[PDB]
Design a protein around this nucleic acid. Structure first.
Ligand SMILES: [Ca+2]
Ligand SMILES: [Ca+2]
Ligand SMILES: [Ca+2]
Length: 341
DNA sequence: GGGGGAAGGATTCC
DNA sequence: CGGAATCCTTCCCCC
């Protein structure tokens, strides 16, 4: 198996650089403004000229504006990035049919039946990089290895605008001397949680006992890291479909008033059904972010599709169930639909 | 004992 | 002091 991984570099910010070439060379920060005070929100994407000064995705906008006060701060236009991303994805499927779109800015290509060795794959990645650059002016990073995890690791090491092949020998080497926190799927919570057991490298998960690792980081991520340490990970490249569509809005003013929250919730439903397009959902969940930024959610699955009018009635019932079983105020309210037909 | 699925909190990531 | 989506553990019914 030879998997090729393509990751669009700082995608959100690069599309803004492409749509306005006056921005390249300058620090660019793509933000999400909730709309409470003037600069309330978070950073979604920052280019590398902004990441060098500590501006990274996740931090508040005012924390970014304290570091780079005159950097270019633009609002996030997800609909634009999704259309550009879909165009690039269509270029990728001309190189292989077995494609796994993992996110808006990355996809896995199974080029086992198109390429003999890692040299042919490296030359294929160079042509994929040039094509994306020629047709969309977007630079990507290419990772090639024996499975999806190490193909993504290759791109993680050579980003941005890079290419890297991890052969069978470097895999066994990376198993011993790669930080466990830089394994795909290992976020911050599991990483710090893994440091509390001395687990710093991938090889160390074998020298521990399974039930100890299972009770701490969960059985799922336990078997995941074990299979990688045994060099037995070989998950296939499968077509990924979108399973959930929802929209959450930050309400102006916190509230526990049903009539005050309903307009936001009904607005969230309308925008959710518009993005649903022809998809008919059978499950609906009402989710609320409390004043202390905690999340509470109530759901309900139907034996049939949910019409928009049914979603209106059921969402009020679920939101009432939230207010009945939690006494905190609500800061953000929203809905999510799943279990399509 | 566990299949099968629903509920919803917990993580990951742009 | 965002927001989208998936992950994944528990719980439940019942054969
Ligand atoms: Ca990216
Ligand atoms: Ca990515
Ligand atoms: Ca990580």
């Amino acid at each position: 198996m030879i998997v090729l991984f393509v990751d669009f570099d700082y995608f959100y910010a690069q599309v803004e650089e492409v749509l306005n070439p006056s921005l390249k060379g300058k620090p660019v920060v793509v933000c999400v403004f909730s709309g409470r005070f003037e600069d309330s929100g978070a950073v979604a994407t920052a280019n590398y000229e902004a990441r060098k000064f500590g501006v990274k995705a996740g931090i508040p906008i005012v924390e970014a504006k304290k570091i780079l006060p005159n950097a270019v701060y633009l609002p996030m236009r997800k609909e634009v990035y999704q259309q550009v991303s879909s165009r690039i994805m269509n270029l990728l499927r001309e190189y292989s049919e077995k494609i796994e779109i993992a996110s808006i800015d990355e996809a896995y290509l199974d080029i086992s039946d198109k390429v003999r060795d890692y040299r042919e794959a490296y030359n294929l990645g160079l042509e994929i990089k040039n094509k994306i650059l020629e047709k969309e002016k977007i630079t990507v990073t290419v990772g090639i290895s024996k499975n999806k995890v190490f193909a993504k690791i290759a791109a993680d090491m050579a980003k941005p605008n890079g290419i890297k092949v991890i052969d069978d020998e470097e895999v066994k080497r990376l198993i011993r001397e790669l930080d466990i926190a830089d394994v795909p799927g290992i976020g911050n919570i599991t990483a710090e949680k893994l440091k509390k057991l001395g687990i710093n490298k991938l090889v160390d998960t074998l020298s521990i006992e399974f039930d100890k690792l299972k009770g701490m980081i969960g059985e799922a991520k336990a078997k995941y890291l074990i299979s990688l340490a045994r060099d037995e990970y070989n998950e296939p490249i499968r077509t990924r479909v979108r399973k959930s569509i929802g929209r959450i809005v930050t309400m102006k003013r916190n509230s526990r008033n049903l009539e005050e929250i309903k307009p936001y919730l009904f607005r969230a439903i309308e925008e959710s059904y518009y993005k649903l397009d022809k998809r008919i959902p059978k499950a609906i969940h009402v989710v609320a972010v409390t004043e202390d930024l905690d999340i509470v959610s109530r759901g309900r699955t139907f034996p049939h599709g949910i019409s928009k009018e049914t979603a209106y009635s059921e969402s009020v019932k679920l939101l009432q169930k939230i207010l009945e079983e939690d006494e905190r105020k609500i800061r953000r309210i929203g809905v999510r639909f799943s279990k399509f037909i």
